[PDB]
Design a protein around this ligand. Structure first.
Ligand SMILES: *[C@@H]1O[C@H](CO)[C@@H](O[C@@H]2O[C@H](CO)[C@@H](O)[C@H](O)[C@H]2NC(C)=O)[C@H](O)[C@H]1NC(C)=O
Ligand SMILES: *[C@@H]1O[C@H](CO)[C@@H](O[C@@H]2O[C@H](CO)[C@@H](O)[C@H](O)[C@H]2NC(C)=O)[C@H](O)[C@H]1NC(C)=O
Ligand SMILES: *[C@@H]1O[C@H](CO)[C@@H](O[C@@H]2O[C@H](CO)[C@@H](O)[C@H](O)[C@H]2NC(C)=O)[C@H](O)[C@H]1NC(C)=O
Ligand SMILES: *[C@@H]1O[C@H](CO)[C@@H](O[C@@H]2O[C@H](CO)[C@@H](O)[C@H](O)[C@H]2NC(C)=O)[C@H](O)[C@H]1NC(C)=O
Lengths: 124, 107, 124, 107, 431, 431, 431, 124
């Protein structure tokens, strides 16, 4: 089975720092763009950040920009998100998702394979 | 911010339509609209991978469309397995990837 | 003047099929869309679909797809609506109308000119 | 699917009076709202295409107004020619959807 | 860049390229307005204006007449057909009188408009208006009483400036039957292409890359003439949407690998040369030289020009001798000595009767090469000489590696008959 | 148009095209007269006239220096050689000093002449005289006492207008060594091509055809430079004669038919693709991709690019399983998934490991295709998707027919060795 | 010229050609000075000077952004890679700031310089200065107080003349992305090319040759853009050094030789067609169909496009039936009737069901040809007719000879299987 | 043997109508242009009409124009000539002849295979 599996999420205090790691398996990871999506409890999906297939491009939400850092290892097939200066508003389940685009009419990626999600709780 | 009705409901076998609405920077900029489903506590499942297009494992009773600044998803033959959240997604020329506010289908 | 001479009435059994007609005139036939729309007595107007007379490309409403099929003859400048497996609920007046276009583009299009509505009766 | 809603369902009126007719969408259809006049037993005739515009041939006493969700058609001084059914039509989406109609009737 | 020499099959794979693959098309419908030039006439005879006006009118009327296995030929043919078939589909959506009216009426209020065409495609629309403005506001005022030998000679010089764009669009569409193979500056100014790129539903990652590589954008696109509609010409420019980006790509180059058996040569050549990329969990081969143009690490290809190939085809690079995958080769008794110049070096084949050398301009001859294949990394020498033909090596630096192994041509015996074979699988050449 | 899908061999034949086949050449010998520009000289130094006059003189002197199986390659090489050899044969005839004197003396009293050369070929002849008239009647009057910085600025602007044609003919012949690939508007105005077409020794059927398809006439022809003669420049324009017209023509396109047994693929691809026509009861194949050009039903080809083929080759379109005719195929273990776009549809080959789908811009995915060849008629869907590459189908309507039958690759076993073969007859692939 | 028809294999060898083979490159680094056009600005609004100045500035800004077996394919690719790799090596060496300073500083005192670059190559350098002289000495004096509606209209016309060259260099490098395929008149005037040829470090033989064949020089060479350096653009032109001259060269052409066995055809075609030369005690084959160009007896080729072929390969012309050398052929059951036009005649293959004739314009049908291959010397007829397609023979004259002998296709039996084969050695076709 | 065989010739009163019919056999009829040529008794050959290979072009002599109409069926390999408004001057043998052109110097068809001729008499 093609699987994404998040790890490294947990409990941190405001101002805290944490590093999520999502292991990719079953697919040619070097071929795909990879995204982090978060869900605040009882709320909707927020896009967090994106990294391109060979790491040459990355983008973040305005909530994450400057604070977070997305990176990948294509040999260990693992996606990483460093989070710095975490806040209570960052309490969410974070999903890694494989990003794919048809590219015929426009370039907007759909997310086809989604990980299990890791919870992150930010509270004093 | 792409906007959706908070909940919709229908009897089994009815047709429920979820609206998705946007602005000149996302859906109106020409960025296509994708749709996702999420059963409680599950990871989201992709239901419509582009405008209209269904991946495998999505029965023909799901349907979607895009029309200028807005988009829609219609679940025909509504069934108990459909009682999930649904989210539209597009891209915003400034905000990058934008999800809608999400809709709970209630059966 | 722009005239859409539609076919006179007909009557059919449930489960039969009907082929309505619309002769176009006074306009550059290939250049403007034709919409077919329906009025069940006692109900509001209902859109069947449109046909592009140049390419013959069509769109059908979700409620008629598979039952309807539009067609044109570019030599006779004539348009036809074919509707299959009629029902008592298809007792209606059927209209042929020329589309014209918003400056937003012909996706945003209204119906400048209309034909004499062909009433069709479906009964035992 | 844009349900259009139109009021009043009929409008008793007299010659010379200022008839005004209202149509409300269920989404911002911008100005993409035509108006049609139907006399009984006759094909409809386009009066207004963009909600403020006016078809080339039609009497200047007809005047459309409004943008977004709510719209009106006004007849500045009604003439005995004008007693008819009227429809709004949105054209922001497919399917094209029409108001249920209103009949302007002699008081 | 990284280049592995593959001694087992006298081939190199250069890795480390970043894909820029054309997934789709974006349309700018240009309206160019000429105006009532055909309603103007000159009575005076000899005149600079008459010469310019008659040239302008001729260009307008001639434009009224214009209207639109060996995998290399297969793929590049398919890509040529696909591109024009995609463009003509949009052109046929535009061609409708109602739609060109909608475009033209939008561009009355503004020089730029977006149109959602009735077939659902969303296109930019742009007005080129300078010539109609000249024709109406100045030239028509100057040609009073049909006089045209006016002393205001600035009119005539100006006229030959404003019409120049129109004449070139006419010339380009006339010469190319209405499908211009690249987007001239006359079709679309840089001020218009930059605006179109800015107004195109793509991520800023593509936006930056497209503004940096405007010439690659301009040449991967093309134009179609829609037609002439009174005092105006309607044409469309197609711009590339690069919807697959930054994925891994590599180039294989290969040279004849030969060995002497009974004193007679057995040879093989790898036929699977050219560009490869990964797209969305699949490997795609770009078998023809006319597509995958390359700048720096970025390799720019039409996705329609790709042939999907199994991921296991990488085993024709890593240990082609053991793989059960049918690696495509040509083999025979044909020892062609040659230099396959490669990004980070040269594959040099030299065989009996031909002399092969490497040298530096200051050192002179650095070495005389053994019979066989040699990968000369582009730091080992400035030049390779064959038969006294001198080949220059690339200056560009990178990693170079050698995957050692006994050549297939040596390690396996040639098939007794038929020994010469073309584009066959390797198990068919060697017993 | 009518298209038959041929399920026996994964190919389509589209019928209903009307031939326009180029049988011969009509010659117009242009004389363009520059006049005594080299006898004019400017003393004043800086001058607009001097700059234009020096450019005019330079163009004249540089022109004085200028003077003139895999069937696709063989057919188009023959066609290229035939065209230039025929053109040069006439050019050789016109070169004689007595003959250019005869042409020049004929055009001394008229702008148009018909000459019968000593070879017995009769050619049209046309003067271009506007530049000599300018040089002689006006500029030689303006340049008094070798003064050239004159205040009559209209002269310099006019001079740049009249010489523009001459400079372009020079440029085109200079760049193309005297044999231009197509007839520029500078070589022959439309006002002259219409006159040449009228004068051709051809029926009014071709006249109607050639005046409507002027761009196809202009592109099938070419120019040859004869030389420079006494301040006149002599060149010939070669126009096509379309002596075979309205006969049946059809296009064959094919994609790989593959089948699996014992888990391994057997593939065949037809190699006899491209255009066919009937000429004088013979059937003729046009294997070159660069010759036959299509406009609606009319297909325009050089007859020299044709290879004569037995009429029984049509059996490869109806009974390729059983015909004794050597139907040319390539075969092997090479299941290339691809889309062969065709006039009325697409041949969609998709095989193990590659996903294949069809869809519409307003409906989504209409169907998922089975492994094998699917002929997707262009009414079935707007698009085909392979590997997530999207191919757009043609909008053109027509009859589509399916000649059902078990694919040959399934009906017969692949030959055990050599299983992969290129451009062989079908009996050699399958046991 | 001298042509031998070789009846043993339906081929001709035409001899007597004199080599002119490109061995190296001579560089001219042009500096083109545009000047302080970017400091100039127009306040007046509508102006001819403003339109020309804005066009000049825009061309400068866009140029600131621009920066740079089937042996036919393998040879053509190797030659293409070799040329650009050779030229870019010089470009990399010129591109250093210290060197462009050295070039620019040398060209202050003079319009011409020779620079020995640090890479040890010495290059010519040439200043194009007329536009800077105009911009500085006149236009800057005209545009006082940023006024640009100057009544001295001579300024605007002059400006359009002086900048024309700059705009064309920009256009050619913009379209080609910095590597032009031939040396335009805008890149290099005839006066500049003649000056460069004089300076070229070559013998007076090549000097006379290169001055007479200036177009062949100009077409074999190419340009590379170095970049833009403030008010100036640097580009290099590459001129061909013809270091092998006057050596023997010959062309082989062939047509299908077929024979009827059990009523079935056996055919062979020689595939070693094209140009050959002797270089320095080696014979070299030029399979690249685009390279070798002929003027008179002189055949002009890139040495990088050559493939070294054994001297014994001449035995495929003398005794192909008995030579042990692997003469490359294709063979099969494929009787393609065709005309192979050759310098001094034509090979005319006609086979069952195809009619074949020769004629003259005055005689009519001279003869009806027998089935088989006929060599028709270009003195035997004016034309060859196949299927009513008329092929016209050359008028050039020279010795024609026939090396008689029973065709191989008749004298040897075809191999029972695989009978159809491509690019195989002849011992593999015939048992 | 390649044969053309005319039929339908006979006696007609002035003003009458007749339809000639020439069967073609032994050749690929759809490849060739086809013509009618007539011979008045004791006179020379007059060209009557021409039809192109796919009938896309047709021409008539000035005596035949409007009065006569040439047509062909490529499937039954038959050439036809409707003659209306026949006259005494139309009394002639009519030959169908296969037209052929080597368009090298010019397009003028020779007539290579000729039919038997059928005789038309027009008299009161
Ligand atoms: C179709 O609709 C357009 C509007 O979209 C109509 O255009 C108007 O035409 C009148 C008369 O020429 C002008 O005064 C208006 O200014 C036009 N409107 C706009 C927005 O430009 C058009 O008349 C309609 N019919 C046709 C056949 O085009
Ligand atoms: C073209 O005509 C216009 C209009 O006359 C000229 O420019 C304008 O002229 C009016 C007076 O007639 C002024 O009020 C405007 O301010 C002028 N506009 C500008 C931008 O200066 C113009 O000079 C004429 N010539 C050209 C080449 O455009
Ligand atoms: C070339 O010379 C002719 C003849 O001298 C000029 O033609 C005259 O032009 C004026 C108008 O400028 C007319 O009034 C005369 O009637 C013309 N005469 C003839 C005989 O045509 C012409 O202007 C000169 N210049 C050009 C560019 O043609
Ligand atoms: C550019 O400037 C030079 C210098 O002012 C001008 O050269 C003069 O041109 C006139 C003729 O118009 C001669 O009589 C003078 O002798 C020239 N002087 C020099 C120093 O050469 C020139 O005219 C200006 N324009 C152009 C286009 O060169």
């Amino acid at each position: 089975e093609v699987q994404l599996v998040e790890s490294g999420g947990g409990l941190v205090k405001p101002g805290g720092s944490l590093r999520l790691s999502c292991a990719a398996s079953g697919f040619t990871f070097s071929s795909y763009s990879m995204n982090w999506v978060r869900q605040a409890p009882g709320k909707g999906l927020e896009w967090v950040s994106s990294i391109s297939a060979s790491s040459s491009y990355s983008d973040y939400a305005d909530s994450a920009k400057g604070r977070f850092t997305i990176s990948r290892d294509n040999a260990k097939t693992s996606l990483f998100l460093q989070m710095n200066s975490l806040r209570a508003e960052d309490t969410a389940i974070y999903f890694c998702a494989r990003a794919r685009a048809t590219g015929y009419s426009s370039i907007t990626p759909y997310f086809d394979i989604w990980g299990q999600g890791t919870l992150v709780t930010v509270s004093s | 911010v792409v906007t959706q009705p908070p909940s919709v409901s229908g009897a089994p076998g009815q047709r429920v339509t979820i609206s998705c609405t946007g602005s000149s920077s996302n859906i109106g900029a020409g960025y296509d609209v994708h749709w996702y489903q999420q059963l409680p506590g599950t990871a989201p499942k992709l239901l419509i991978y582009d405008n209209n297009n269904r991946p495998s494992g999505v029965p023909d009773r799901f349907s979607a469309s895009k029309s200028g600044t807005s988009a829609s998803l219609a679940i025909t033959g509504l069934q108990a397995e459909d009682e999930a959240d649904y989210y539209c997604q597009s891209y915003d020329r400034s905000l990058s990837g934008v999800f809608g506010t999400g809709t709970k289908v209630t059966v | 003047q722009v005239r859409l001479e539609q076919s006179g009435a007909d009557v059919k059994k449930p489960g039969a099929s009907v082929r309505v007609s619309c002769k176009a005139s006074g306009y550059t036939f290939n250049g403007y869309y034709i919409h077919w729309v329906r009025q069940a007595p006692g109900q509001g107007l209902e859109w069947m679909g449109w046909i592009n007379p140049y390419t013959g490309e069509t769109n059908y409403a979700q409620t008629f797809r598979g039952r309807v099929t539009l067609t044109r003859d570019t030599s006779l400048k004539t348009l036809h609506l074919d509707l299959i497996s009629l029902r008592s609920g298809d007792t209606a007046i059927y209209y042929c109308a020329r589309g014209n276009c918003s400056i937003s583009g012909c996706y945003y299009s209204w119906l400048d000119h209309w034909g004499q509505g062909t009433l069709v009766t479906v009964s035992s | 699917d844009i349900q259009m809603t139109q009021s009043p369902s009929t409008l008793s009126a007299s010659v010379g009076d200022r008839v005004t007719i209202t149509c409300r969408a269920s989404q911002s259809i911008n100005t993409w709202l035509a108006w049609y006049q139907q006399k009984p037993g006759k094909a409809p005739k386009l009066l207004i295409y963009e909600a403020s515009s006016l078809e080339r041939g039609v009497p200047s006493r007809f005047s459309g107004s409004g943008s977004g969700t709510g719209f009106t058609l006004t007849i500045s001084s009604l003439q005995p020619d004008d007693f008819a059914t009227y429809f709004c039509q949105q054209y922001n989406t497919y399917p094209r959807t029409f108001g249920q109609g209103t009949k302007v009737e002699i008081k | 860049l990284k280049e592995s020499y593959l001694e087992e099959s006298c081939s190199t794979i250069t890795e480390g390229y970043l894909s820029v693959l054309r997934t789709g098309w974006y349309t700018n419908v240009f309206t160019l307005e000429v105006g009532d030039v055909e309603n103007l006439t000159c009575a005076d005879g000899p005149s600079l204006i008459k010469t310019e006006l008659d040239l302008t009118k001729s260009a307008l009327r001639e434009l009224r007449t214009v209207s639109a296995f060996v995998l290399g030929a297969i793929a590049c043919g398919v890509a040529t057909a696909a591109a024009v078939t995609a463009g003509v589909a949009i052109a046929k959506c535009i061609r409708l009188e109602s739609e060109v009216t909608a475009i033209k009426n939008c561009l009355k209020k503004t020089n730029e408009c977006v149109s959602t065409l009735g077939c659902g495609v969303r296109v930019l629309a742009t007005a080129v208006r300078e010539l109609k403005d000249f024709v109406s506001k100045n030239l028509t005022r100057a040609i009073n009483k049909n006089k045209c030998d006016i002393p205001d000679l600035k009119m005539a010089v100006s006229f030959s400036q404003f019409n120049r764009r129109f004449l070139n669009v006419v010339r380009q569409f006339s010469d190319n039957a209405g499908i211009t193979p690249a987007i001239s500056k006359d079709l679309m100014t840089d001020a218009e292409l930059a605006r179109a790129i800015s107004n195109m539903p793509t991520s800023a990652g593509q936006i930056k890359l497209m503004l940096e590589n405007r010439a690659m954008v301009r040449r991967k696109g093309f134009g179609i003439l829609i037609g002439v509609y009174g005092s105006s010409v309607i044409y469309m420019v197609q711009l590339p949407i690069f919807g697959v980006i930054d994925t891994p790509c590599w180039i294989v180059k290969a040279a004849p690998s030969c060995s002497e058996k009974k004193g007679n040569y057995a040879c093989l050549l790898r036929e699977d040369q050219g560009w490869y990329c990964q797209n969305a969990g699949s490997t795609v081969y770009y078998p023809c030289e006319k597509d995958c143009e390359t700048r720096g690490d970025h390799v720019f290809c039409d996705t329609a020009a790709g042939i999907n190939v199994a991921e296991q085809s990488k085993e024709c690079n890593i240990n082609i001798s053991t793989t059960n995958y049918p690696c495509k080769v040509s083999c025979g008794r044909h020892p062609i000595s040659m230099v396959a110049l490669s990004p980070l070096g040269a594959l040099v084949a030299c065989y009996k009767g031909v002399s092969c050398s490497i040298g530096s301009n200051r050192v002179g001859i650095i070495k005389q090469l053994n019979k066989g294949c040699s990968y000369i990394t582009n730091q080992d020498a400035d030049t390779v000489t064959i038969d006294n033909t001198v080949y220059q090596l690339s200056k560009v630096e990178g990693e170079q590696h050698v995957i050692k192994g006994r050549p297939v041509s040596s390690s396996f015996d040639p098939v007794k008959f038929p020994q010469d074979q073309f584009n066959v699988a390797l198990d068919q050449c060697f017993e």
